[PDB]
Amino acid sequence: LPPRPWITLKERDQSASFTVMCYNVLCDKYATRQLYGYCPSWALNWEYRKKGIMEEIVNCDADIISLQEVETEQYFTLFLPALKERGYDGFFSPKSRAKIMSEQERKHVDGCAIFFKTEKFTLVQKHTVEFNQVAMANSDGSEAMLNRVMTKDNIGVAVVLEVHKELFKQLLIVANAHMHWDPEYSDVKLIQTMMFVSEVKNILEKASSRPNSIPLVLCADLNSLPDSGVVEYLSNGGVADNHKDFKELRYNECLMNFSCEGRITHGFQLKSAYENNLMPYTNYTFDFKGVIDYIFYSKTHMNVLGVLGPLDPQWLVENNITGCPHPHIPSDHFSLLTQLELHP
Ligand SMILES: NC[C@@H]1O[C@H](O[C@H]2[C@@H](O)[C@H](O[C@@H]3[C@@H](O)[C@H](N)C[C@H](N)[C@@H]3O[C@@H]3O[C@H](CN)[C@@H](O)[C@H](O)[C@H]3N)O[C@@H]2CO)[C@H](N)[C@@H](O)[C@@H]1O
């Protein structure tokens, strides 16, 4: 397994630089022979894969790490203890807090974690966004909001961090979400994204009023290709309320609850670190290969200096690798890694 390359996109000036990782590790619960039958059982097994997962994370050595598919017990016994030793602290929330289940099932619920190096950042606030609660609260007048959106218990997490002056009070919000997966539910994915951005803006308003100005880095497994309403909404500061992906009700007035006519907008002016298909895919399986993971950043606060390019495709060809995971690749997603430059 050859080390991944690095694409330089812009030189360092000559004021704060830091790196961000985004990585869906593939949780044990979903690593089944049914879905990944082309991978031998011994290489699917968590006791085997978790080693490759930790190696990938250690090798990337990112200042900030956003993971998806982190199982609750594994956050507390594997990811946090190990990354504490590398100088990180972390924030984790699982999905399904409100769902009733046994002690044993609770250990295996997955969720999102953000880690940050404490020599560079200090935690100011931490937040969990429950898309099912936000949908329920904004569902008046929409059966679809209640039937299709509220019933999915996906989440995102966000932290407000202090960026230490030595790297140049400067604040930074890092947000990390994992959206619903089903290709037939583009509406849910889009609404979940608008709910998340909307709630992050509410978080940001309450980070400022404590004696628009705060940069955002948004990591996510959006389960959405670059041509989707989700990515258009994130990249262009808004989306039409009649966008095809809303699958009717399109023009529902309930969408405007997230919406700051006909356009649902946000003011974050985001850009994707990997735009212009610098990786041809982020999820790589036999049945599906495509870009569905993203690192977005406030383009008025930050430059992209570089990204970690894709695993060499001739290597996948020579080794006949048509899907992941694989004995040498421990997740069906490739990690994303970017170096950003923050100008206060
Ligand atoms: N062809 C339609 C496309 O599907 C893509 O996603 C693919 C994949 O991510 C997703 O399914 C994947 C596939 O392993 C297989 N279908 C089992 C399982 N559902 C898994 O979904 C899993 O669960 C999480 C739940 N939260 C997902 O967010 C996460 O990406 C994934 N680990 O559905 C697609 C099937 O591969 C993208 N959503 C988008 O490109 C478009 O919708």
UniProtKB/Swiss-Prot annotation:
Residues of the full protein shown: 169 to 540 of 555
Regulation: Inhibited by free AMP, and with lesser efficiency also by CMP, GMP, UMP, ATP and neomycin.
Signal sequence residues: none
Function, as annotated: Has 3'-5' poly(A) exoribonuclease activity for synthetic poly(A) RNA substrate. Catalytic component of the CCR4-NOT complex which is one of the major cellular mRNA deadenylases and is linked to various cellular processes including bulk mRNA degradation, miRNA-mediated repression, translational repression during translational initiation and general transcription regulation. Additional complex functions may be a consequence of its influence on mRNA expression. May be involved in the deadenylation-dependent degradation of mRNAs through the 3'-UTR AU-rich element-mediated mechanism.
Organism annotation: Homo sapiens (Human)
This protein's name: CCR4-NOT transcription complex subunit 6-like
Enzyme Commission code(s) on record: 3.1.13.4
Top-level lineage group: Eukaryota
Chain spans, region Nuclease domain: 1-344
